[PDB]
Amino acid sequence: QDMLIGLYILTSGNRRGICANRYNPWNHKTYQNERIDDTNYKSMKEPFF
Amino acid sequence: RIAPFDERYEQEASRKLVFSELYEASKQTANPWVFEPEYPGKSRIFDGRTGDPFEQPVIIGNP
Amino acid sequence: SLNEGEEVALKNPDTIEAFKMLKPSYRKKKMEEMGLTEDEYYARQFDIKGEI
Amino acid sequence: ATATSISLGIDDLLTIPSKGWLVQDAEQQSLILEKHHHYGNVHAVEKLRQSIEIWYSTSEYLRQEMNPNFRMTDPYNPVHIMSFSGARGNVSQVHQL
Amino acid sequence: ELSEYEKDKKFGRPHPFVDPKVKKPIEEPLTSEELWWNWRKPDKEQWSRWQRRKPDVETVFLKAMAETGQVKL
Amino acid sequence: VSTQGWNSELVVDYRINEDEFHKICLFDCDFFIRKPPDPDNDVYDFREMYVTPPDTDVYAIPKVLAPMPDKYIRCAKTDYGWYNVTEPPIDAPRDPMYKSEREVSKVFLTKHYRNRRLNDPEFVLDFEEIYVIDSRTKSVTRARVLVTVPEGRNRDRKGDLLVIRDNGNSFKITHASKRDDPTTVIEREEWTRTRQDMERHLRKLRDFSISNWI
Amino acid sequence: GGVFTGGTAEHVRAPSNGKIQFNEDLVHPTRTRHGHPAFLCYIDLYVTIESDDILHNVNIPPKSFLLVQNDQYVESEQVIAEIRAGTSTLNFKERVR
């Protein structure tokens, strides 16, 4: 029981879909949009260990 | 001193009693962790040997 | 409808009528097609049945 | 299992949302049939054979709708994690709470 | 363009599940008289223990931030 | 045995040397295209093709569903694979705990820009012409790539990002500046596919008509 | 204790709110074991429900026990037709008073 619950919680993954984003990621916006690619570049994305 | 089968007066009467008493205890004595209004009856306790909060709220009481 | 069986197809005549008469709109159709208007279709069920 | 921690409160016992309607509708048919049983419309066996069947069908419908409710709205409910992971607690046992 | 929704489904803003552009009403189904005695709703509302909505916690938060504009019920 | 159609895989009773052909390994078939001599194996004379079951000597011309080139085109070879990772049974100690094999199902062939060289400082893929080699149903088809770039016909070919999609069917060309992040594409399909499931699950509730919030 | 594992029966519930529509001519009147009027169907019917924008088709196999009439309003989840047979949902017969 206890070790099983620990291992299940460990291997449970992230939140897949609508439980991780309130709004749709289609949402054509936040592109840092202009005629050139020289804008603010944050791109939090995910770590690249 | 609660007689058994208090669910005759109401529906979920024990829940009302417990939650109202918890809220009154949290309000009269300013202890906002007694009645957390997002998971009532539970609170987030810390670790005695790391100073870290256990990730999920834990039910505490005085049995 | 209890003479036939527990759950069987109702093919007996005068039993389909009982099943079909559960709808009040059908009772209206039955009485108007025979006539007698209203207030008399109610009073014709109290008649003595048997050796008149 | 410690750092994350789990515990059982009162609001983690998550009754499925549709129980409010199913039990109410089950009571209506039990009220109507027991009212017609006094009118001679049905006999004793039919009343017995139905009061066993509404509450068996309704109870077995809530039981089969428990996991789909848990697995879509509250995937990390403490009762769900304890039983769905296979640690302790049957599906039937959770159905009692 | 994309409807009067602005396709709120495509964006994710609060919006009714059904389309408020057809919403075609019912077509006068059978009324109480033309129904068998098992489905009748016997014309006098019956007392039942399950007649008041369950208090619940999230029904309080949904009403709480509906006033603050974060929720469109 | 020209580049004719239509939906007949005519068999051939003559063995043909494959040391002058192109070995295109697929899952349920093995397409063959003639290889004219060249320094770096970069010409595909289509004309005569032959498709065979995987590693079999029985030859047969494939099914042609679109016109094919009649000249020497320098193109590139792609693939569309899954890497099945099924876990086999364990019989003896030290037996493998997992398996792996590619399942190439579509071999797109993208023409070079006016058939340039491999090392010349003008390398650009010509994304207009792409030919699809299926595996489930042995056949060769020309792609129907689409261009949303406002420049249209007159544009710079030194970077026009191409997007392929579900099962090698959709084909779009977009400016290389507006390339989607790896996380955004994954999150996009997850959001769309799980919003249908949530709506489908909630459809059975009595209050679904009068509702809101997704 | 008191509750065990045994047999059940099959029920068909409405896909959603709507208006049951079908041909009342192909079914043959009956009386359910609960004492209610119903409809035996010996063939494959296609009962349709006009759920405003949707036209959910319900599949009814033969030897079923349609419990609903034509043009009858139905709620979301509510039994409208039994699938097969009936009885106390078990194997073989006994005799009780």
Return d(Cα B56, Cα D77) in angstroms, integer.
Answer: 11
The residue whose two tokens read 């991780």 is: A20
Range 16-55 of E in CB contact (< 8 A) with F: 16-18
The residue whose two tokens read 């009324």 is: E31
Q: Is the dihedral of CA F65, F71, F77, F78 positive or negative?
A: negative
Query: Given A5, A12, A19, which is nearest D87 (Cβ)?
Result: A5
Q: Per CB distance under 8 Å, which residues of A are interface residues toward E? A: 21-24, 26-27
Return d(Cα A2, Cα G28) in angstroms, integer.
Answer: 58
Tokens of F71: 């000249």
Residue type, F207: D
Task: Yes or no: say if F191 and A25 are a contact pair by the CB < 8 Å rule.
Answer: yes
Return d(Cα D85, Cα A8) in angstroms, integer.
Answer: 7
Return d(Cα G77, Cα G70) in angstroms, integer.
Answer: 18
Residue type, F115: N
SS3 content of chain B, % helix, strand, coil (to 5): 25, 10, 65
Beta strands in G1-97 (DSSP E): 11-13, 18-21, 28-31, 37-41, 45-49, 57-60, 64-66, 72-74, 79-82
Task: Classify F189 as helix, strand or coil.
Answer: helix
Cβ neighbours, 10 Å, residue E15: 19
Task: Yes or no: say if C22 and G47 are a contact pair by the CB < 8 Å rule.
Answer: no
Nearest alpha carbon to residue G75 among F90, E15, D28:
D28
Task: Yes or no: say if F133 and F24 are a contact pair by the CB < 8 Å rule.
Answer: yes
**Residue D96 C-beta-side C-alpha neighbours within 13 Å:** 9
Task: Yes or no: say if F93 and F81 are a contact pair by the CB < 8 Å rule.
Answer: no
Return d(Cα D79, Cα A5) in angstroms, integer.
Answer: 12
Q: Do F214 and A18 touch (CB under 8 A)?
A: yes
Angle at D11 between CA D10 and CA D12, to 5 degrees: 95
With an 8 Å CB cutoff and a minimum of 3 pairs, decide whether chains F and G touch.
Answer: yes
Tokens of C23: 């709808």
Identify the H or E element spanning F110.
strand F106-112
Q: Is the dihedral of CA F150, F153, F154, F159 positive or negative?
A: positive
DSSP string, D45-66: HHHHHHHHHHHHHHHHHHHHTH
DSSP string, C4-52: T-SS-----TTTHHHHHTTSHHHHHHHHHHH---SSSTTGGGSS--S--
Q: Does F210 touch chain E (CB under 8 A)?
A: yes
Query: A28 to chain F: which residues are within 8 Å by CB?
Result: none
Nearest alpha carbon to residue B6 among B14, E48, B17:
B14
Rounded to the nearest angstrom, the minimum Cα separation between D2 and chain B is 7
Quoted resolution (Å): 3.2
Q: What are the contacts of F65-71 at 24+ separation with CB within 8 A?
A: F65/F5, F65/F6, F65/F7, F65/F139, F65/F140, F65/F141, F66/F131, F66/F140, F66/F141, F66/F142, F67/F3, F67/F142, F68/F3, F68/F131, F68/F140, F68/F142, F69/F129, F70/F3, F70/F46
Nearest alpha carbon to residue F175 among F160, F155, F156:
F160
Task: Yes or no: say if B21 and B14 are a contact pair by the CB < 8 Å rule.
Answer: no
Q: Please state the φ and ψ torsions of residue B13, each to the nearest 5 degrees.
A: -75, -35
- Longest pairwise C-alpha distance within chain D: 65
C41: which residues sit within 8 A by CB, 6+ positions away?
C27, C31
Q: Does A4 touch chain D (CB under 8 A)?
A: yes
Under 8 Å CB pairs connecting chains E and G tally to 31
Q: Do A4 and D6 touch (CB under 8 A)?
A: no
Q: Do D46 and G33 touch (CB under 8 A)?
A: yes
Task: Yes or no: say if F30 and F52 are a contact pair by the CB < 8 Å rule.
Answer: yes
Tokens of E45: 């509302």
Cβ neighbours, 10 Å, residue F172: 15
Return d(Cα C9, Cα C4) in angstroms, integer.
Answer: 9
Return d(Cα E38, Cα F133) in angstroms, integer.
Answer: 63
The residue whose two tokens read 């049974």 is: F89
Cβ neighbours, 10 Å, residue D81: 22
Which chain D residue's Cα is nearest to A9?
A: D1
Q: Does B57 touch chain E (CB under 8 A)?
A: no
Return d(Cα E17, Cα D75) in angstroms, integer.
Answer: 23
Instruction: Identify the burial level of F91 via C-beta atoms within 10 angstroms of its C-beta, where 0-12 means exposed, 13-18 middle and 19 or more buried.
Output: exposed
Cβ neighbours, 10 Å, residue B11: 14
Chains that touch C (3 or more CB pairs under 8 A): E, G
Rounded to the nearest angstrom, the minimum Cα separation between B33 and chain D is 15
Cβ neighbours, 10 Å, residue F173: 17
Q: Do D11 and E57 touch (CB under 8 A)?
A: yes
Query: Do you find a cis peptide bond into E39, omega within 30 degrees of 0?
Result: no
Task: Yes or no: say if F29 and F53 are a contact pair by the CB < 8 Å rule.
Answer: yes
Residue type, B57: P
Return d(Cα G8, Cα C6) in angstroms, integer.
Answer: 19
Which chain C residue's Cα is nearest to E34?
A: C23
Cβ neighbours, 10 Å, residue F140: 22
Identify the H or E element spanning F133.
strand F125-134
Q: Do E51 and D24 touch (CB under 8 A)?
A: yes
